[PDB]
Each structure stands twice: as C-alpha cells, then as structure tokens.
Design a protein around this nucleic acid. Structure first.
Ligand SMILES: [Zn+2]
Ligand SMILES: [Zn+2]
Ligand SMILES: [Zn+2]
Ligand SMILES: [Zn+2]
Lengths: 90, 78, 94, 104, 97, 253, 90, 87, 104, 96
DNA sequence: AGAATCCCGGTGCCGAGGCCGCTCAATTGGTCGTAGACAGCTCTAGCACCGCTTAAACGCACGTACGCGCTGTCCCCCGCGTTTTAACCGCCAAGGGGATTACTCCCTAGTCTCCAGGCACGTGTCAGATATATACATC
DNA sequence: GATGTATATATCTGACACGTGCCTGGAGACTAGGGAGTAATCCCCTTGGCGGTTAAAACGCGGGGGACAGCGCGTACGTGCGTTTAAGCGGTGCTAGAGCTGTCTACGACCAATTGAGCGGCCTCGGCACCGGGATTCT
C-alpha cells in the first residue's frame, strides 16, 4: 500500500530527487577523464542533474511498461535492458 | 565514487516513474546506465568548453551537449 | 548590454491578452524564452533548408508557410497558418 | 509605427527580421517573411500560455510556474508531438498509475 | 392584413433574401443546393466552384488548405430547404388575405 | 388559421436545426467544428473542460477538441436575422415559436420544461414517460425488458430526479423496486455507465431510458452499488442471468 | 521449417512487398492530399524501400518484446509496446 | 479536375505472405493471426506521415509530381535517412 | 599543382571549399577549413570501403554491392553509431536468430 | 544544359583502388557512397555552422571542423579522423 | 533415403571500365577591409574550508505478496496440396508536366538620419510557503 | 475506531508588478542591381490499356506446439524501527578566469585572366545471372 502513496506523492512534486552534493561529485569524477582542472558553473551542474534525472525517470516509465508486459510487477535487470535497447536504437 | 547515488535516490526516481516494486538487483544496473548517460553528455559539454578556450563548463555548454542528443532543456537560456 | 535579449516583455503582453488574471514566475519565463527560441530556430531552420532544396536565395512568407506545415503536428498548423496569413494580409494592406 | 503594430502582432516583427538576417538562414529575407513568422511564434506562445493559465486555475494559483507549463504540454496531445523531445525544468511528470498496480 | 402584420410580412420576405446573401461569389449567385465550405476562411462554393478551389484555391485569398478541408455542411442543406419552403408559404398567406 | 401552422413549423424547424444538445432554443453563441453541426461556445467549452480525457462529439461518433473550432460566422449571421424574423413572426402569425419554452431563462427550469413538452409530442423511442407530479424535475417512466436480457418481458418503473444543471450533470436515476442487478441499489439508485465519466448532454431522456434497459441487458460489476450481486455476475455470469430472470417475474415493477 | 525461411529472407536483398499493390497503397493515401498527383517511378521505389525497412526494424523490436515475455509467438500487444517505447504513438 | 479517382481498401494489397516475409526478415519465428491486421494499421500511419511531407515539399515547388528527392527529404524530416535514391 | 595534390588528398579540396560557401554555412570560410574537412571525408570513405571490400572477398565477389556496404556498417560498432539511423537501399539485414528460437 | 548536382563518384573510385586495387563498385553501390559523402558533409558543415554562432564567430576555420568531428564521430573513429585531418592541413600549410 | 544449401563448367546479358573532345570551375596573383588574435585590467562568481543543524541513508529482523517452475487442457498456428487471382514482362501510343532559355521590372540590400521601445536598476506591495487548529474522507 | 488528507487562517520572507531615466536597435526614405516572375519551346517519362505466362496469394484440412490458467513452494523484497551519516545551510576569505576594452595585422571576400580535371557520350571487353547436373549437408 505504501508504494502507491509514494508514487502519488512524488508525481505531484517537482524537486530534484538526487541529493545535489553527491551528484556534483559524480559529475566531477567523470569530467576529469576528459580534461583536468575544469570548473563548473553552479547552474551548469543543475542543468546536468536535471537532464540526468529526466533521463532516468523516462527510462523507468518505459521499463515499467516492459515489466507489466511480462506479467510481473517488480522491475528486473532484464526489463531495463529491453526497454533500453528498443529506445537506444531509435 | 558512483555510490554517491544512494539506493533511496534510485527508488525515488523509480517512484516518480510509477514503479510499484523494485528488484534489489536493479540498483547496480541503474547506476551503470546513469554512468553511461553522463559520460556521453559530459564528453560533449567538455568539448564545447575546450573549443571556446575556456576552462569553465557553462550551463550553455551542457545545454548544447544535450540538444545534440535529442534532449532539449528549457530554462537555462538556450 | 552584451547580455542576450529575451522575449519576456512580449510574453507578458501575450499573456495579458489571453489570460489577464494571472502572472508569470521568473522561472516560468525562462522556460518560455527557450520555447520561443526553440521554435524560432526550427522554423527558420526549415525555411533555410527549403530555400536550398528549391534552388532559391530569398525567404518569403511562402517558404515559411511550408516550413510551419512541416513542423507543427495535427491541427495546430492549421491555426498557425491562419494567423500567419491574416497578419500578412493586414500588413500588406496597411 | 512599427511593423508589429501594422501586422496586429505583439511579437517584435522588427526583431524577427534582424534575427533571420543575422542568423544567415538565407542570403535574403523578404518583407513579409518576419511578419508571417512573428504571427506564428505569437500564436504558439498564446496556445501554451492559455493552457498554462488553466493549469494555474486548477491548483488555485494566480501565477505560472514551470510545472504548469509542463502539465499544459503533457495533457495536450498536439503539443506532446511538437515538444516530445523537450524537458521542462522542474516540470516533474504528468501523474499516472497503471491499472495493474492499483487495488481491486 | 393589419398595419403591423403587413409590415412584418414584408420584413420576413426581405429577411429571407438577406439570409441567402451569405452564400456568394461571382458565380454563387443564389442559395446553393449543395454548398461547399472551406475550414479556416468560409468562402462557400457553387456546385462547380469547389473544383477550382481544389485545383488552385480561393481567388485572392488562396488559403493553403488540403482537399480534406472541403465539405458540404449538412446544416446548410436543411436550412436552405426551409428558407425556400418559407418563401412560398409566406407569399401564399399574403396573397390569400 | 391562414396556414399559420405551416409557417410556424418551418420557422420553428430553423431553430430546431440551430439548436445544441443542452439548449432547446436558437443558439446565440454558435461555433463550428470539424464535423457537420453547430454548438454553443459556452456549452461546448464546459464539456471539453471536464476531466474526462478526450471527449467524444455529443451529436456523432467523432471526437471533439477546443482546437479546430471556429466562429460559425455564417451561422452567427443567420442567428441575428432569424431573431429579427421572429420579431416579425409574432406579427405575421401571432403564434408561439416554442413548445411551451417559457420556463426560467437561466435554463434550469426552461430546459427541463421544454424537454418534457417535446416528450409529449415525441415520447421515448421504446417506452412511455411523463411527470410524476411533485415537480418539473421529477419524472416517471415505464420500460419493458428487451429480448436480449434475463429481464425480457419485465417492466420497471422509474422515478428520476433532475438537477438544475441537467443535462450537463447526470440525474438521480432510480427504480421504485429493488432489482437483482450489480448496478441497482436496494434503495432503487441506478448507476449507469452513462451517469458518470461518460455522462454528457449527448444523452436525452430517450437515450437515458434506453441506456437503463441496455444495462439490464449487459450489467457492469465494476464498482457496483450492490457487491453482493456484482460478484456473482462477474464470476459466473450465467448464474446471474438465471437468478435475475426469476427475480424479474415477481419484482420487475 | 521457419528457421530456414528466416535465414533465406534475412540473406536476400529483394523487396518483400509486391511492387504493384504497394504503389496502389501509396496513391490511395496520396490522393487524400491532392488530386491527380503524379509520382516518379523512382519516388515510389524509394518510399517502398523506406517502408519495408521501417517494418522490419519494428518487427525486430517486436520479436524481442515477445521473447522477454517468455513467448515465441508475437502478439499485437507486442507491437504496441515496441511502438510505445520507441515513442511512435505516445 | 477530370481525375478518375479510385477509392478502395487498398491496404489489403499488403497480404499475409508479405507481412510474414517481413516478420521473418526481422527474425520472428511465429506470428499470431491478429498481427496481420495490426501491421497493416501501423504501415498505413507510417506512410501517411512520409507522404504528407513529400507532398508538402512538392506543393512548395509548384510541381505536380512527387520526385525521389521529395521522398528523401520527407524521410529526413521524419528522422530517418535513406541512401540510394537521393544524391 | 592542385590544392588536393598539395594536401595529398583524394577528395576535391576545391569543391569542398565551394560547397562550404555555396551552402551558406557561415559568412566566411577559412583557408584551412576545406582541407581538414576533405581529409575527414576521405578517411571515413576509406573506412567503409575497406570493410565493404573485405565483405566482398568473404562472399567470393569482386564488385561491391549495396548489401556489402551495409554489412560492413552493421558489423562495425563505430559505424553503427554514426549511421545507426540510416537505411541502405536493398541492404537486407544482418543475419540473426536468437537462441530461444532454436531446437534444444 | 549542364549538370548542377555533380558527384563524388570519381573520388570514391580512387579511394577504393587504394584500399582494394583489384575490386570495383556497382552503380547502385556508388549511389550509396555518394549519398554517404553528402550526409557526412552536411553533418560536419552543420555542426561547424552551429559552433560559429555559439561562439560568436563569423568564420569557419580548421578549428571548428576539428571540433565538429570530435562531436560527430564516436570513440576511436574520431581519434583517427582528427589525426588524418591535422596531418593533411599541416602538410598543406607548410607546403612540403 | 528425402529435400534444401552450396559448387563445377558453360553460354550469353548488359554493366562498367577506359578514352575522345569540350568547357565550367579550379587555380593563380593582386588590392583593400576588417574580424580575430593578442595584450592588459576589473571584479564576478566559483573553490575550498569550518561548524551546527537535522532529514536522509545504513543496517537489522519479521513475514508475506510476489516470482518461478510444473502440470494439464484448449485452439489456432504452421505445413501441405490444390485452385484461382492478378503480379509482372514486354509492347504500343498519346499527351501533361519538367527542365530549359530569354527578357521584365519589383523587391530587398545597403546607405545615412533621427527617435521611443525595451534594458538595467530600484522601490514597495503582496502571493505563496510554513505551521497551527478545524473537521471530514479514507484504510 | 484509527490514521491521514484537504480547509480556512495568521504570519512574514523573499520575488514579482510597476515606474524612472538612458541609449541602441527600429523605422523612415532613397538609390542601385539582380532575383525570381512570366511567357514560350520541346523532350522526357508518366499514365493507361493490350494480351499472355506463370509466380504468388487464397482456400480448406490435419494435428501438434505453444499459449496460458491454475496450483503450490521459496525467498527477495517491503515495512517499520533505531543508530549513526554526511547533505544542506550560513558565513568567511582567497583568487582564477570570464568578459570588456583597445591596438594592429594575417588572411579572406572579390575581381580579372589562364587553362585542365572532371563531365557526358561512345567503343571495347569481362564480372555476374542463371541453366543443368553433382556432392555435401542435416533432419
Ligand atoms: Zn461560387
Ligand atoms: Zn478563402
Ligand atoms: Zn447550448
Ligand atoms: Zn459531430
């Protein structure tokens, strides 16, 4: 019963769901492999974080469809791979 | 270092997407997917920055990086 | 100044003539600025491509009609074109 | 009087003219080109704002916020086809739960 | 007929002509049996008038419409039949007394 | 009576043509759509503004949107002149141009009074109906069961209470007798598919009365009024039809 | 038997839809925009090639969806899912 | 004007064997009998989108013939690129 | 000499230059622009043809056919990303049967 | 009465022989390669044009083309394309 | 032993591979303008740091809604053979639209002059966010 | 009955609606020139219809593999609880580089003049398609 309460509560909101600081750390750890001594505008990090969450949320919406298609409720590694492949090749 | 994206953080994203149940194995896969996405966007964003001979990645560089991948953002001045 | 100009002043005017009871938050305005520039580029983009595809150098209202019908889905184009032709007609007569 | 005034438009026809020329979309831009375009840009702006307005009323608000712009886009199928590749900042998602996940 | 009635009878007759005035071109000279309308600008067509708006479009107006935007309005079909029926009914009553 | 009925009927027919699903009078604010029939701006916008998802056209099987609609223009012009003709009509024949459409101008009463007046001239397609006598918002009807039903040959009596916003919002449809059916309450309340998310001005007294017998033909156990019956229909289906038939023979009315 | 058929159809480069009935379909649709509209014979070929490529790509995705559901036979439901993820009708 | 237009259910020109072969190329082992109806539906919509644009380009050029170039541009507009018919 | 000769390229540096200006991509085109571009077009062309040629040899053919151009692409991850959205006329498909469809 | 389209078919032949001296290419296959060249050309010219606007420049130079390639080509394909590009320009510029 | 995938040798089809002759577009060299490269300075917005705050995340134990595999029964799909349709080849003619030239003159580019519509900035109201107490609608 | 969601209010902390003064792009009015608009020629190639051959689609039947509906078992999550964890907030202080301004010069648009690398069509073989028979899969 809780999952349904949470789905409604989160869909009604707009805030970013990933904690901002640890997200920024991830960005920096990736960025260093392209160029050293890079700096980021604080708004740039937000832009990137927002794009990232939007990507994953959309992916989860499609993944969920794949899961119910298979007549299951729980999201499996198999379901994300399928949804990702069909989308990935478009 | 990718562990910065906590299990609850993933769950929250999944809930917004309308997921009722999550297999515990998805968290490791999800992080993998995210890692790849960011690598692709950042690679492009850095390239734009280098082109302009700047050492700062601006919001506009992230936006352009995303426009090229078919994911346009609004609200960042692009 | 060198800071890029936006359409926030025009978005206000449009809203007031449509839904006068409400205002626009600054973040919402930012979204609208991207929207206008996004659509602007798409239409201008197609108008450019058409000029090349049809071996022409000048863009006129005719090329734009084509560009709009190609970009706007469903019935949206029908209304958009109507407004376009009316504006041109009035402009021409003025 | 301005071109926008003559055309009965709110959008800056004079600016559109400049943008089309500077943007190098073509070697030349016709007199009726920016007029027609401004009308289209204004029309689409009006469509999205009208819907955003109604969204504000639904939430008993008198000010448009990013969420309202997205709810307007997402509920209208036509706009979804046009802006299906666009993410609105702080737009969240359009509420939706599939029947298979609900109580019986 | 009485001073107020006879005025009204003449009005109703004139009104019919004004109702029909709505369907006109250089050739749509009268009320049409099978009028074709174009969405977005009206400009109702004769029975052999729509063929030209299909080929080229409206004269001067030239609305860039598809051939799917052209159709006969059923509401006109019915209203038109009634306006003809009324014309005759009004005239006969005026003649009779 | 110098052929005044014929003049009256042709003029009244003009109004009949230019009349929406809600209004039973000449449309004063007409708008055109993709399909061939005119609606009021106010009436159609209210329908489209309901949270029912995409709406279907009340006068045909096609759909409707706020977009694609345009000033009826020609028809707006017809309305103005037709009103001027009515002015003359009162002097030409001196007759009414409405079937007792003299109720309250808000439409709350005029609409229900006018529909009942028309009902008397043109009753429901497959049944009889008229007023109860308590108010103009309380109607009765007698309906016989269609062949494609466990209720075949049975006859039920209705007592329907209409709201002031009828037919924009659904009426309180009720039977005076309890019927063994998933959608029928022991207190007589009836839950039709058409009385909730599918309710619209599209539905007239004839259509509503027909819909009730249609539901008897094919019950809907999803969110029932009487779960104690709905469970049987949903699971066994045939068991329900047999019991309903036996019940009908004694309690149909 | 079907497996041999798959190998042969994947290997060949031939058009799988008969040319004449395809051209008829194109005209049947095209006439709804303009009357008396002509086509270059090459234009129809180009369209048919794109058309077959489109459907084959869709079938490849459809097949994967059915496999995911632990089925071999593809259903209309699987086509709809593939289109829903691709975003053709969403 | 003067067009002997033919209005028919020409979608039926795409028969079971044709769809079956396409599905086989896609690696499908078994096909439900309901697929044939669904597939035709999908194809029609796809073609409508491509043709609509190809015609639109032709109209712009004030031509009465849809050329290979117009089909190719239409496909690019739809986000799909075809090689071998254009230049 | 020619410009392509000086660069040591097979592609027409001179025509690349003309296209950059004719296509109105920018108000001005730098002298080193068409040379660099020509080199890239050549490189990519060589990569596809080399692989297509290899496909032809495997099938015991001497002349390249559209199917070989496509197979070379389908068998190359770098090219699948580059030309993933491209359809090659009469290319057919890359052979593929899933294990779940086979006898056990 | 002159062609206004031209093609790269003559250059494709030359490149083909350098890689596979004993092979040939059909006219249909040539149509594919010709289109390919124009497709890539447009993509590179397209990104270079966008870079000019995004960086407030009115001239496309070898720098923009280089960047455009890094954006358009994946992985190691880009790595080689850039190398071939810089080599051709260096030789050309020094005229050696 | 049966039926479908290749190979081997042979003729012949028509595709492409090389060369003739011509001329648009490539190449060269010179003039002048300015857009870009560079140097040089201000002070904006970002980096790293500290300490306190408290909502978020970690880890654990209970027990049960779901996932997984197995059995059994239904039907509707695939393979086969036979009949019927109309897909396709090759041929014929008419004739409608495409691509081409050659002249016209109307529309847009570029030039300066001069002005008020939008920009940055600051002031003062007030619209939404948080938290409390109010009663119902769910679970 | 026992929790949790919308209701109406007080409070107040930033952000929005408006107004002021500046100047930078807009509009006004004129010349020059070249883009595309019209008329008129004539050459493909599109449409339509003719028949005949015969490959592909359509019908009906056999019967068997896969779909899927129900059963029962096991455990991988979901729910709550309690204990730390570092994420978020505010404030401080340093300084690297983003952006503004001004100067000067490689180098790019543009023109006119020379000429040859590729275009377009024709002559000559040689790589594939496909016939007809054989052996190797391969079920
Ligand atoms: Zn007419
Ligand atoms: Zn018109
Ligand atoms: Zn009404
Ligand atoms: Zn309708």
């Amino acid at each position: 019963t809780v999952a349904l309460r949470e789905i409604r509560r989160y869909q009604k909101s707009t805030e970013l769901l990933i904690r901002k600081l640890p997200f920024q750390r991830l960005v920096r750890e990736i960025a260093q492999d392209f160029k050293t001594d890079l700096r980021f505008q604080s708004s740039a990090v937000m832009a990137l974080q927002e794009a990232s969450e939007a990507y994953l949320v959309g992916l989860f919406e499609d993944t969920n469809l794949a899961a119910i298609h298979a007549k299951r409720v729980t999201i499996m590694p198999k379901d994300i791979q399928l949804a990702r492949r069909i989308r990935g090749e478009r | 270092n990718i562990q910065g994206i906590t299990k609850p953080a993933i769950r929250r994203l999944a809930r917004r997407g309308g997921v009722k149940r999550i297999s515990g194995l998805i968290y490791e896969e999800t992080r993998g997917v995210l890692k790849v996405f960011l690598e692709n966007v950042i690679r492009d964003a850095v390239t734009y920055t280098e082109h302009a001979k700047r050492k700062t990645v601006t919001a506009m560089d992230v936006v352009y990086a995303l426009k090229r991948q078919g994911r346009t953002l609004y609200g960042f001045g692009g | 100044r060198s800071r890029k100009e936006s359409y926030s002043v025009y978005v206000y005017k449009v809203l007031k003539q449509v839904h006068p009871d409400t205002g626009i938050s600054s973040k919402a305005m930012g979204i609208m600025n991207s929207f206008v520039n996004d659509i602007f580029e798409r239409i201008a983009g197609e108008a450019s491509r058409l000029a090349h595809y049809n071996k022409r150098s000048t863009i006129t209202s005719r090329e734009i009609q084509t560009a709009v019908r190609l970009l706007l889905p469903g019935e949206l184009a029908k209304h958009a074109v109507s407004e376009g032709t009316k504006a041109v007609t009035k402009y021409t007569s003025a | 009087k301005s071109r926008s005034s003559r055309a009965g438009l709110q959008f800056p026809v004079g600016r559109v003219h400049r943008l089309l020329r500077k943007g190098n979309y073509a070697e030349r831009v016709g007199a009726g080109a920016p007029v027609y375009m401004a009308a289209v840009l204004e029309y689409l702006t009006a469509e999205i704002l009208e819907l955003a307005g109604n969204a504000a009323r639904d939430n008993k608000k008198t000010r448009i916020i990013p969420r309202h712009l997205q709810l307007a886009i997402r509920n209208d199928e036509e706009l979804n086809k046009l802006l299906g590749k666009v993410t609105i900042a702080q737009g969240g998602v359009l509420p939706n739960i599939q029947a298979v996940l609900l109580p019986k | 007929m009485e001073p107020d009635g006879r005025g009204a009878w003449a009005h109703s007759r004139a009104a019919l002509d004004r109702l029909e005035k709505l369907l006109r071109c250089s050739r749509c000279t009268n009320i049409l049996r099978e009028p074709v309308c174009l969405g977005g600008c009206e400009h109702i067509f004769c029975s052999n008038c729509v063929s030209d708006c299909i080929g080229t479009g409206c004269p001067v107006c030239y609305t860039p419409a598809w051939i799917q935007d052209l159709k006969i309005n059923r509401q006109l079909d019915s209203m038109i039949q009634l306006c003809s029926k009324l014309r005759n009914l009004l005239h006969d009553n005026e003649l009779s007394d | 009576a110098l052929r005044v009925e014929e003049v009256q009927n042709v003029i009244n027919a003009m109004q009949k043509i230019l009349e929406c699903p809600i209004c039973l009078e000449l449309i004063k604010e007409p708008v055109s759509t993709k399909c061939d029939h005119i609606f009021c701006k106010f009436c159609m916008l209210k329908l489209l503004n309901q949270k029912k998802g995409p709406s279907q056209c009340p006068l045909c099987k096609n759909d409707i949107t706020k977009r694609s609609l345009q000033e009826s223009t020609r028809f707006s012009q017809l309305v103005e002149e037709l009103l001027k003709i009515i002015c003359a009509f009162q002097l030409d024949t001196g007759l009414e141009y409405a079937n007792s459409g003299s109720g309250s101008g808000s439409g709350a009463l005029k609409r229900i009074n006018k529909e009942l007046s028309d009902l008397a001239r043109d009753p429901p397609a497959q049944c009889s109906a008229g007023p109860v006598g308590d108010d103009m918002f309380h109607w009765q009807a007698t309906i016989m069961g269609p062949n494609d039903s466990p209720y075949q040959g049975g006859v039920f009596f209705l007592t329907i209470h209409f709201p002031t916003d009828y037919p924009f919002k659904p009426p309180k449809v009720a039977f005076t007798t309890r019927i063994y059916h998933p959608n029928i309450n022991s207190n007589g309340s009836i839950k039709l598919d058409i009385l909730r998310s599918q309710w619209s001005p599209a539905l007239t007294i004839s259509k509503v009365l027909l819909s009730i017998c249609s539901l008897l033909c094919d019950p809907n156990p999803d969110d029932p009024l009487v779960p104690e019956i709905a469970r049987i229909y949903k699971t066994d289906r045939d068991k329900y039809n047999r019991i309903s038939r036996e019940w009908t023979q004694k309690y149909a009315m």
